[PDB]
Amino acid sequence: YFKIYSKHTPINLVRDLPQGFSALEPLVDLPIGINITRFQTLLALHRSYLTPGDSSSGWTAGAAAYYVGYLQPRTFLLKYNENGTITDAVDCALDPLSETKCTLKSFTVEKGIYQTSNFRVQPTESIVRFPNITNLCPFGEVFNATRF
Amino acid sequence: SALGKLQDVVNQNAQALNTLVKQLSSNFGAISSVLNDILSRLDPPEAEVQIDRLITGRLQSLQTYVTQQLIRAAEIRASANLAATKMSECVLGQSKRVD
Amino acid sequence: SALGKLQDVVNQNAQALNTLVKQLSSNFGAISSVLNDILSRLDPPEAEVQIDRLITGRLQSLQTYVTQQLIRAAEIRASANLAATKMSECVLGQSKRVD
Amino acid sequence: DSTECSNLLLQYGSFCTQLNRALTGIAVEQDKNTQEVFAQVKQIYKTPP
Amino acid sequence: QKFNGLTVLPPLLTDEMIAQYTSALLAGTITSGWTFGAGP
Amino acid sequence: LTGTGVLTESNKKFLPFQQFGRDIADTTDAVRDPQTLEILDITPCSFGGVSVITPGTNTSNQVAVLYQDVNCTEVTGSNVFQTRAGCLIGAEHVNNSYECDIPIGAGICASYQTQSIIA
Amino acid sequence: LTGTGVLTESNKKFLPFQQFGRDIADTTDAVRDPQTLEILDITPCSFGGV
Amino acid sequence: QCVNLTTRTQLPPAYTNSFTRGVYYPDKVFRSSVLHS
Numbered sequence: 245y246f247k248i249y250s251k252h253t254p255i256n257l258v259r260d261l262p263q264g265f266s267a268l269e270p271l272v273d274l275p276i277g278i279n280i281t282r283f284q285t286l287l288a289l290h291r292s293y294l295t296p297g298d299s300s301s302g303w304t305a306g307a308a309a310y311y312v313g314y315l316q317p318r319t320f321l322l323k324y325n326e327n328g329t330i331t332d333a334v335d336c337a338l339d340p341l342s343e344t345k346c347t348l349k350s351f352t353v354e355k356g357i358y359q360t361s362n363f364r365v366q367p368t369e370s371i372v373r374f375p376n377i378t379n380l381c382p383f384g385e386v387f388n389a390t391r392f
Numbered sequence: 393s394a395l396g397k398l399q400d401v402v403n404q405n406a407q408a409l410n411t412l413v414k415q416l417s418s419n420f421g422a423i424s425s426v427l428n429d430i431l432s433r434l435d436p437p438e439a440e441v442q443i444d445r446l447i448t449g450r451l452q453s454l455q456t457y458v459t460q461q462l463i464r465a466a467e468i469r470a471s472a473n474l475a476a477t478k479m480s481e482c483v484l485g486q487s488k489r490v491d
Numbered sequence: 492s493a494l495g496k497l498q499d500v501v502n503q504n505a506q507a508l509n510t511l512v513k514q515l516s517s518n519f520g521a522i523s524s525v526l527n528d529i530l531s532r533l534d535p536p537e538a539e540v541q542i543d544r545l546i547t548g549r550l551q552s553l554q555t556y557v558t559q560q561l562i563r564a565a566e567i568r569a570s571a572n573l574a575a576t577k578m579s580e581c582v583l584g585q586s587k588r589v590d
Numbered sequence: 591d592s593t594e595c596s597n598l599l600l601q602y603g604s605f606c607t608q609l610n611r612a613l614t615g616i617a618v619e620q621d622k623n624t625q626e627v628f629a630q631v632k633q634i635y636k637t638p639p
Numbered sequence: 640q641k642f643n644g645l646t647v648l649p650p651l652l653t654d655e656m657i658a659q660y661t662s663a664l665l666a667g668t669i670t671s672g673w674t675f676g677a678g679p
Numbered sequence: 680l681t682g683t684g685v686l687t688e689s690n691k692k693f694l695p696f697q698q699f700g701r702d703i704a705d706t707t708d709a710v711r712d713p714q715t716l717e718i719l720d721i722t723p724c725s726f727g728g729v730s731v732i733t734p735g736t737n738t739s740n741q742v743a744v745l746y747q748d749v750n751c752t753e754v755t756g757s758n759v760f761q762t763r764a765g766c767l768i769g770a771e772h773v774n775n776s777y778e779c780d781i782p783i784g785a786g787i788c789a790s791y792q793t794q795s796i797i798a
Numbered sequence: 799l800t801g802t803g804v805l806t807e808s809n810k811k812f813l814p815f816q817q818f819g820r821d822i823a824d825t826t827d828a829v830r831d832p833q834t835l836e837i838l839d840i841t842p843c844s845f846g847g848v
Numbered sequence: 849q850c851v852n853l854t855t856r857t858q859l860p861p862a863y864t865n866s867f868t869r870g871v872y873y874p875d876k877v878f879r880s881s882v883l884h885s
Contacts (some may be wrong), residue, residue: 319885
């Protein structure tokens with residue numbers, strides 16, 4: 245299934261994405277069933293002028309900007325309103341504090357000290373130690389014998 | 393937060409009773425945590441082996457809760473005996489016992 | 492040793508931890524009590540049933556220790572409550588209570 | 591340190607979190623015990639030389 | 640003693656602090672009596 | 680014999696026939712390597728628990744962190760402060776002394792006052 | 799949603815794609831009708847001890 | 849058709865900050881005032 249979520253907001257900010265939280269809500273769920281690994285947006289370009297043979301002369305591109313974030317498997321503690329609308333969220337693997345918020349399952353924590361997780365040191369190399377053969381069996385006396 | 397001692401009992405009881413409910417959605421090694429599903433897709437020869445795993449898991453998760461409630465009830469009973477002693481010796485009288 | 496009351500708590504806690512760690516050398520009915528060896532010479536299909544046998548036994552051994560530690564903590568807390576009462580009523584005052 | 595064990599362990603729910611929550615509660619209670627016995631004095635009095 | 644998952648946390652009050660508590664209690668019950676546990 | 684931990688030389692002896700050690704609980708604490716026939720030590724590389732100090736998100740979004748029981752030459756860098764209960768990352772140790780606000784352990788307490796987190 | 803209980807109609811909000819409500823501790827509490835796109839409640843039909 | 853326009857522009861990618869953004873309803877589930885993980 246190919247899932248699409250959208251949210252259309254009137255903004256005033258100068259160039260980049262705004263700061264207020266807003267929750268996307270799905271449009272459609274198409275049962276396509278194909279593999280997707282790559283994609284590309286489609287633009288609308290005016291033909292400002294025509295040089296006879298270029299085919300690529302007057303393609304102006306208006307004035308817009310678009311962004312491509314990527315989704316990663318993360319745990320987000322969400323905040324549902326009374327009507328059912330999401331209003332806030334926090335990460336978990338962001339920093340220790342988001343980890344605190346996740347662990348305690350509340351959006352305001354009170355002064356104290358809270359255990360969140362553990363940690364272990366990771367091994368660095370694999371060393372394989374099998375008999376390399378020291379006083380080798382006499383295979384040089386059979387396979388190299390001058391007199392069979 | 394002046395009534396923290398009273399609020400901790402309620403919060404502990406709620407947390408234990410909530411963990412009791414949320415153990416109803418555990419496989420415990422079974423294919424599915426929902427009991428009619430393993431009924432609806434496996435024959436009685438092959439269903440009992442999973443229903444029995446759910447039985448052991450849920451019965452153990454109930455035994456744990458009952459034991460923890462037994463331990464916590466003794467603490468509340470000690471607090472209640474202390475409160476009865478205090479009401480006797482300090483509301484119904486005047487105590488020479490320091491502090 | 493007239494400090495036997497203090498030594499008993501340390502001995503009991505050390506014995507509980509020693510039993511807890513010596514429960515890691517029990518198979519509880521599986522082909523081995525070491526986990527890397529089960530994972531090293533069995534495919535995923537046939538090792539899961541054996542690793543689960545360790546899982547249930549070790550979890551049950553941990554629950555036993557935790558429950559008995561809660562029970563022992565409930566007794567150490569009663570002793571510490573009595574000690575606080577004695578510090579309030581005998582160091583900070585003079586007690587009429589006999590014995 | 592065995593991921594094959596840990597994924598199978600998650601099927602048992604929150605037994606491990608429950609055990610950790612039980613042990614932390616009696617860990618803090620030990621500090622409470624010591625606080626209630628000895629910390630019964632406001633200030634730190636001294637005897638004269 | 641740390642072997643595998645086993646941890647020991649330190650007491651919040653070190654033995655020097657507990658000794659200071661008991662010394663303060665014992666120096667208060669000598670110079671002042673029972674009066675220091677009931678006021679000034 | 681697969682296994683995980685640190686390796687170093689052993690000062691103990693074997694007898695000339697012996698293959699490994701085990702001090703307790705079925706875990707090997709030494710190996711004699713197949714080729715050199717040299718004895719080695721096996722001891723697990725460390726671990727611990729992670730705690731996070733907050734003065735309350737009502738007051739600030741600032742935190743210190745304990746990593747329990749690590750001589751943290753092996754872990755940030757915001758004035759690491761090694762103590763008996765771990766090492767703080769995010770709090771500045773001071774020479775002053777106040778009442779305990781947040782108990783760290785082993786006599787160490789943390790507090791938020793002017794100006795990040797003091798220990 | 800193979801469940802039991804008593805069904806009364808739901809007076810709340812779903813999104814145009816939502817199917818069923820749920821309460822804390824993951825217990826379904828309200829449902830949608832797949833032929834009439836219409837939302838109902840669910841609460842357990844009574845039990846107890848004697 | 850199929851005119852090609854990308855002659856030579858090979859600028860390095862520019863990045864901006866997505867503060868609290870791209871959060872969608874990951875469920876068909878209505879939920880009243882709860883904090884869900």
